[PDB]
Symmetry: D2
Subunit: 197 residues, 4 copies
């Protein structure tokens, strides 16, 4: 079944940009809950279907979307987060940089639009840098709740805008979080994602 | 494996209220598409799960909801329709009639409010008479697209408000469709559901 | 122009159930932001309407829904909260208590159903005890984000399930918050609302 | 007062690709209903605000989005439609041709993508070729119901996937409609919107 991926660093390795207690709760509590809920959903869909109860199997689709989205979203999230002193922060280079410039004008303009995109989210949700699977063309998208980036879009970089991703440190000052997190984004990971398939 | 149920009468039995062409298409084409989509979603989900691809599994949630919802909703829809010369039309009686009367004042008022609810649906959707699983109180709810009536509420009588349910015969004049369909509602089916919920 | 209502008590007066900092931010930051956004939207709608720019006028709808809902919800929310030493806590009496018994069997069943409702919200949202304006029947509903309770239902008592409502004090342990808040619900306010709806 | 815009041709001018009956219904009944609906929402929002009733004003937001969106979407829709014999059909030229070829690979690749997006719409909705207001970066997007394309994205070409846009002629065969409509898309208009 699905498992919680370990982090590549200690919970407090993203300070002062994200607090240890946030990293701790977020990974060990919130994501774990999505892992658990993802396994429970697949198991119920399975057991309902072996019984020919499609009404029941189809009634689990929202929980599969919520938890399956959560597990995926957070997995990609830790992956593109890293300590500022090491591979976190800065900006991309090579092929990824060139497409960002060609699709957004500059990295700085992309940053602004993404922060703007994050700001505009009403309630719980995510903003993503994504590409078209076929052309590679880049876009800034947002997702409500745990809805994922899938299908025609491949996700490259995600910032979680749920209140639980920042409130303990930044409280209602969500702008400060959105500005701060760029220091711990791992653009090496984003490039790998972009430069593949 | 999920299957398209046959109707209990011929495609033209509900004329003049719903045309034979509408019924034919609605069943043979539209509902069939939902059945196939449901089995396809469920196969693709199991295929993924065996290969530990939870990303793919979760990505199929929308199609499971949509097609799983279409199958259930249309299944119940056909069941609460019957030719006017038989079990269709008229008004409910017995415990059902008293329950309608309790929660809506009269059958006529319920019929008025449901017609309004159908009229107020923006885009594609369904209106249902539903029953609270604990108290038994009745209400009119609306659902977008093919989202089902599930959880706290049990569906008893549905009317489809997607344009394919009426456009060939009534065009934009949805109010005429909503008024006409009461002539072919199977209140014997509804009362059966009412007894078991 | 819309204005921030004043609380009827000091920020720390709902302790230990809700912390002072939470009440402070929730009222002076979050609600104040909705009030500002609502006025901003209504000014913008008027400015475009006078220029015959109906494209602009329509585009301001999500903001009008978002802020105007947030204004309504929180206004109501402060009104059905009070200190335990005073009007807060306990159980309702009179017509309300009995109406609750009629539609949920007991006050405690309703309580469990409310907490179950709150817990089941995916993402940001609210749970309400509402009353049907025609039948007088009570029900528990949920709303996404700041989507209000309007139309056929009249809100009677609301609980806020957005994370900023509890996270500083309860962190991810929302069930502690949902359980804890009943000690500061103002049933007399809810009773006034019941009487007049 | 918002008003129903005039079409620049007779209702039967888009046949055999869109029928006279669909066109007449779509314009004279559906869009007219969005026009009246918008004006009513703006009125009641005007009434409400004067009364200091902000609960009533906010409660009108769903209708404003729905009707205001429908007015905008259909306005643009007729503008990017024209009789095949004239401004309709064919391919876009100019820098718009170049952009599509840059962003999608080919017009043929782009077309298929949109047709697939349109087919992929669950329920009522639209598909749009849009550009980013700041970069000119093209995207295919979809909107539920009458939700419009505003803000960071500028719509350039819309195709309506509501069932009332095709069912009378094509019935359930939505793909037939999606493939057909390309012979009456006005790319001159789409090219204007692109050049802003
Ligand atoms: Mn999160
Ligand atoms: Mn149908
Ligand atoms: Mn709040
Ligand atoms: Mn249309
Ligand atoms: Na990490
Ligand atoms: Na591009
Ligand atoms: Na907020
Ligand atoms: Na709205
Ligand atoms: Na959409
Ligand atoms: Na036909």
């Amino acid at each position: 079944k699905a498992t919680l991926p370990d982090l590549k660093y200690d919970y407090g390795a993203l300070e002062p940009y994200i607090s240890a207690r946030i990293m701790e709760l977020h990974h060990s509590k919130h994501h774990q809950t999505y892992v658990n809920g993802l396994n429970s959903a697949l198991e119920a869909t399975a057991e309902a279907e072996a019984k020919g109860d499609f009404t029941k199997a189809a009634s689990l689709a929202p929980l599969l979307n919520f938890h399956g989205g959560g597990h995926l979203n957070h997995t990609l999230f830790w992956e593109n987060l890293a300590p500022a002193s090491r591979e976190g922060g800065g900006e991309p280079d090579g092929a990824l940089k060139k497409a960002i410039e060609a699709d957004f004008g500059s990295f700085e303009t992309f940053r602004k639009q993404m922060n703007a995109a994050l700001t505009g989210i009403q309630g719980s949700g995510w903003a993503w840098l994504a590409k078209d699977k076929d052309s590679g063309n880049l876009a800034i998208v947002t997702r409500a709740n745990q809805d994922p980036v899938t299908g025609q879009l491949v996700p490259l970089m995600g910032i979680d805008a749920w209140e639980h991703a920042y409130y303990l440190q930044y409280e209602n000052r969500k702008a400060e979080y959105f500005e701060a997190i760029w220091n711990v984004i791992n653009w090496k990971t984003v490039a790998q994602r972009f430069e593949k398939a």
